[PDB]
Design a protein around this nucleic acid. Sequence first.
RNA 1: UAAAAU
RNA 2: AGCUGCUCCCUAGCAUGCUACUACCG
RNA 3: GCGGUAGUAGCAUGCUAGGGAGCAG
Lengths: 72, 141, 93, 596, 120, 659
Amino acid sequence: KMSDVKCTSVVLLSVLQQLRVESSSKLWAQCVQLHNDILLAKDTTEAFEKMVSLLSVLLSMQGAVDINKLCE
Amino acid sequence: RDAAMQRKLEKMADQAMTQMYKQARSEDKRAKVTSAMQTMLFTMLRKLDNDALNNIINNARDGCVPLNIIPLTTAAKLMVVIPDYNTYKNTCDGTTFTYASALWEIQQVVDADSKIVQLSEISMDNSPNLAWPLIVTALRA
Amino acid sequence: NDALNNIINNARDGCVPLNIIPLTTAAKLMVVIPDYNTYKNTCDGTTFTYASALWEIQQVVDADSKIVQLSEISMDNSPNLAWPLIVTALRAN
Amino acid sequence: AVGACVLCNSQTSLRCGACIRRPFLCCKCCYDHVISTSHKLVLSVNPYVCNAPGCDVTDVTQLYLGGMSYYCKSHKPPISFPLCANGQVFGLYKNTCVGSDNVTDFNAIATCDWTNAGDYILANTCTERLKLFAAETLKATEETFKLSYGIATVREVLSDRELHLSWEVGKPRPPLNRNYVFTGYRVTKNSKVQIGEYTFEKGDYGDAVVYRGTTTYKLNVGDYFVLTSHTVMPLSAPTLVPQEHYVRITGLYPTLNISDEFSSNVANYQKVGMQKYSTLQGPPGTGKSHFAIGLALYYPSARIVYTACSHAAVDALCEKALKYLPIDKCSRIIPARARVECFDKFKVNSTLEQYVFCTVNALPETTADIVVFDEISMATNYDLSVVNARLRAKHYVYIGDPAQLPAPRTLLTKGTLEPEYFNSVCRLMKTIGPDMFLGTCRRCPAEIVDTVSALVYDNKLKAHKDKSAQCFKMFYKGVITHDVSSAINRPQIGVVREFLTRNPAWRKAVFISPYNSQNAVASKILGLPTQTVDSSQGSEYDYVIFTQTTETAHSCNVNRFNVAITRAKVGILCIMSDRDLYDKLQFTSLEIPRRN
Amino acid sequence: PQEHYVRITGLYPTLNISDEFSSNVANYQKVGMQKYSTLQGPPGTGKSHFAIGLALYYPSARIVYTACSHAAVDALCEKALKYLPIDKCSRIIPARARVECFDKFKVNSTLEQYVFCTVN
Amino acid sequence: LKYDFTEERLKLFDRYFKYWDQTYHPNCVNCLDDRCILHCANFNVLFSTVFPPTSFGPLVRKIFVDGVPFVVSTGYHFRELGVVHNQDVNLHSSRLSFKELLVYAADPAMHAASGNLLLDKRTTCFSVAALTNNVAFQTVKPGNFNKDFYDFAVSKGFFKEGSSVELKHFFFAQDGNAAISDYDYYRYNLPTMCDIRQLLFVVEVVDKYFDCYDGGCINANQVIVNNLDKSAGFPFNKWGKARLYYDSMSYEDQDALFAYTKRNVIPTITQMNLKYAISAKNRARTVAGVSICSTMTNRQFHQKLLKSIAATRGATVVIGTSKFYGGWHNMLKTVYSDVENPHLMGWDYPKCDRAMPNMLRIMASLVLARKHTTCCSLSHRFYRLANECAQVLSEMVMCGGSLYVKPGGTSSGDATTAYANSVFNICQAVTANVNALLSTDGNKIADKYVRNLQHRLYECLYRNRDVDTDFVNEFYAYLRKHFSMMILSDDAVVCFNSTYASQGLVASIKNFKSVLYYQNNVFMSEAKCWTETDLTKGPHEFCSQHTMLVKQGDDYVYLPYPDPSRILGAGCFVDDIVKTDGTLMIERFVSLAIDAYPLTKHPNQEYADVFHLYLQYIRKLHDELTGHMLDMYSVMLTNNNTSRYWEPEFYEAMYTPHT
RNA sequence: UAAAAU
RNA sequence: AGCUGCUCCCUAGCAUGCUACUACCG
RNA sequence: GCGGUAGUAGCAUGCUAGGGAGCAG
Ligand SMILES: [Zn+2]
Ligand SMILES: [Zn+2]
Ligand SMILES: [Zn+2]
Ligand SMILES: [Zn+2]
Ligand SMILES: [Zn+2]
């Protein structure tokens, strides 16, 4: 169950990086630290907190058309 | 000497087939990364099943996004957009804001006028007047 | 420059260490500052002194390489900038 | 080297090479296209020829797959296979192929000549894929036909830019307009290098033609000007994206209290935003165009882009935008071509301006929130696909009227095109119904709206703005001084010569004629700045001067008469050959010596 | 090779100054009409009278005069300094000059529009 | 402007060490051998902490070529070696050949003389110049997810909660301040001054460990360069890789260059690069790319000995020995030599490349160069030593976009790194033994041979002043009998007599702690060191592999197995097309299953399931590759022997000895 | 034979 | 964007080696 | 009937050259 969230955080940081988010050093530092801290977690309840904090970065900007990719 | 000239043609055929195939795939794979990564991401997210993430994802569908990283401290700020009233009802009951499966105490609403709105001014009747996409600010419980 | 000839001609042999040539003959300095508390003690104001010379600030940028005016570099506004700032100064006589 | 079949969208690598646009076809579809057409060339990963040195057989239906190559039956190896066999041709992904039975319409499009009305009539009733296919192949056919025109060289030098040329005898000479350009090459012995592009203009007398050079290379006696052709880029996005409805307003946030001058448009302003795309059809000179900027400020924060296929249209609506919006407004029209120039406002290079105005062929690839394409009666499916390809936005809005003017479509020479088949969105507006309707005149005199609504429309127009000054002296027109196929008649100009100064206050009218060259005759002996009836259509002025020609099928067109008379404020005149149109005409009859 | 023009290509003209050089100006616009040509200045006639005259005719463009022998480069600074403002640019020698050469400025920058030198 | 403090060194010597009767040469250019070089550089290391740090480095000077002035380094001043002047420096030249263009474009003189001055408050390392107008911040991206393999592993019971094997090796990402924040770890290199009367004995024993090899110079037509597509350093990487500079120089330009660096000093510039690789800790890893002008020369100087070290079997240094076909068993069987009450032990060097002093680096260079007793003359060996010191031990690192100076310690990406590390490792082990035997109460040593050995060891260190070869051989035999070693570049395994070590007659682990504390400026915690009392289970870890004594056919055999998490992590995380869509990549999994075979013999059970998972995945990959190539074209291939890759007999043959 | 393209 | 070491896989060329059968002589 | 060279086809080894991939310090 924690391996699930670790691989998901890998995919999330890769998407964020593809969206040119490392053009702003503050944001990229925040996301990088959240990612490396998720990968080193050792109890699945902190990982989900930092995952919601990390996904908020993608939900912020409007570059990914969310209503389309949510066709379920 | 005529069986040893189709044994070699029959080998050039294979080492052309097995090369053209991967030259086609190995190039289609790299021409679709920004759109396969996203579908993979959301497949894994939906499979994860965590209400804390489903909440913000659904919310985010109906134009209710946040404006900054969701903080974790028991006291930093969160500034989220709210586009319509039927959104405002389901989340803001009085002065508590229900986002990311938590409870945030609402302190300052401010419409697109960039000027303050009183919380008691927001209701069904008088709604048609406010420049609507608002920005609610709150702090975690 | 005639400054380089000036320092070479004072050498009692003709050869001088390398580490001092940009120290005494360069015409542009670039400071890289990690946080505000360090900016306070080093290039504070618009003219400072380093390497026994008097340098004068012009053009300040940040990690993203976008301009910054010395009015934004206050202490309460410090947590809102890309923190390694790159102050470029010239040699003023 | 792989794609999708044009009919069933399966994986393939075959192209019917004899077809001009080289479209991908699957196995079964390529077999069907080649078993019933003169097209029998195919190209897969490599062309399908007889690979024996000296053989040139190319008919696929008789070729044979040999060793690492395809061979004629005469040059067959001891071991081989036939390519075209069992109702299919051999390509990649053979056993996973889906065969659509649209080969009838596909062959129709592939072998047609675009000369009779049936070709366009079937171009706009097929699936979307075939729609785009027919569009690009038709444009290709036209611009390659343009190659069959004649060529011109020097004859003698007369000045620095008005000289005498020699058209090659026996082949059609191209029309003389500033958008038909020829590149000039000198061939001395030796020496055949480009000297520049040129656009010409027949000046005051023959055979002299004033010209405009791209660079001051001093013209000599041995050069020539050959028309330079253009290429066609294939399309991708459909003509119109599929519709979606909503239950609440999405992406757009209205207002309550700005400029109620756009009063009756509010409920419609909402219906625009609660859909994915909608159309507004309007009789000439009504709330259209007005509606565009009205919705624009009704949604102030909304990014909006405006577009049209004709330059004068986008310019006139940019003017009407300047009349009402913050500036804060740019018209990213054209950097430095379309030599009949345009606006004087801002920028062509920024695309952050909330209001961008341009013409379809020069659109940048931007994001938007609303795209207001204008006058869909003049655009073709090609252009609609161009806009849907370059831009993406949230909503789309199309405004026009199919009863006005269509696209020229030069090569068609028999039959008539009903507006239903002008393109896709005109079809949509007349098949089920403009999903948005607005119809009563604001602009031109009440009486002339009565005239026009009496004839093209069944009568359904009303307005204000009454008299005065309207006249149609049925004027004999003399010598049809026809140098180019565009007509010229200056005995007809003998009426502005009959009314040069006796109009002491009618000084800023606008002169328009169906023919471009007789309008350059208005630019020959000058009365006022003149325009064409095509550079009108979305343009309005106070008083209008108009001249016709003989009763050719050209000028007799009721639609051009519509778009010629309906563009005034309170005065017009019609000088017509006239067998029954002055029996159509609802004004005061005059004569040539009738100056009072 | 030669290529003429129907106009002086970008030749930003003087209005009427130095019409005493008119016997030259009548042909100075010829410079803008063709690619190039030649001129025969017999001894004592219009040598570098034509050149400095056209220099005066176009005071808003960098123009060069060149020679092969340095007696010619001195005769080239000759007949020059008066009709030139100074505002002078005639740099020939960096570290050559077996006899003395130019007299006023530099060799590292090339300032004003009219510059003199030798081909070699 | 003063860079030659030669009289102050002599005055300091005469003030503090006045009655130390040995001759002290302030500049080691005047030394008599290599032991004299060590003796005098030991004092220079101390005295150089008094003078200003802007007076060390290249010694530039203005020359003229074709009447144009350049600024180029004639020779460098060093903290350990003093002042060194080039011998062929020629003012006034007409034109530069290829070789001289190479040696003037590789110098940091004209790059640093013509750039902006720099003050970088992020580091404590002395920063020189900024070669351009804006600093560059380089990041590191996260790895790619191979979802198919992960799903497949999950469908067969892997990664369930509470299992033994779980994922701990990932691709960690890093932000902008990662190159410089990691370069700043050179603040761990201090100016250590070694005990010289003991180092001059340890160096003799260490050299005796390298007696069965042969070295010397080779001509440019005998070097071997594997992979000529590797970057060429700065500034040469603006114009091509190493292939361009190995093709543009004839076999006479390279020889002219080599024979030139025996009389002159060419300082170079090292670039620093951020690695992109899997790992278990989030500390960024970086490597030093050295200039081509330095590798091209160190190759001809050192390659003959380096190659003769990697082709010997049965020695102490086990570089070049392979672990397949019974290599692991042979290595362990030869370490266990004959030792009489054997325990095994292994240790760890904390920050081995930053914290290593400079005296031991110079010692490693001298021990490697001791093989040129015939090819080179004496000043030649000194100028080669000076070149190595100026190019890899104090050098101008080019980090980000600006030049800094490097205080010391090994640069990881130079020519002879993995062998210098081995020399330094043996040096530390021999020092530990010396300290452990001299520091014990000689009144209680009952074995009256070891007591006399102690007596003679002291007398040979601190009394007798010339090398005594018989006792050196005697102590070396004692060491090889009681303390057997197996060394790789800083990775050691020691099988030692336990009865002796208990009575303090050989090193223990505490002795390494003390030696590292006072000779290496680090603290080695007892937690990264391991010991082992049961020899039927070998080293607890060596080269990141554990050892298992399995039954192979008739007899018993040592086999190395890895860490299951490592193999799975390499299966799941990759670089975009690699593995992701492995149907184009079936050799990746063949190799990873070769590495994960010994896990089959393991007493645990999930461990074996790792290997079986890999085999089944190869089978599935092939089954779905033929299915795609069949419908793409319509005919299966005619021959593919790819069915051997999913049966175990192809893999077992890689750990059985014939081959 | 009507518009008109880095 | 480093220096090494080991291993698997594919292709090419050459000579050597090996073997079969065919042509010339001894 | 056999010795010698010259051939083709087939086979194994070894060595060079080229490319791809994996692990270790
Ligand atoms: Zn065809
Ligand atoms: Zn098909
Ligand atoms: Zn044939
Ligand atoms: Zn000495
Ligand atoms: Zn040597």
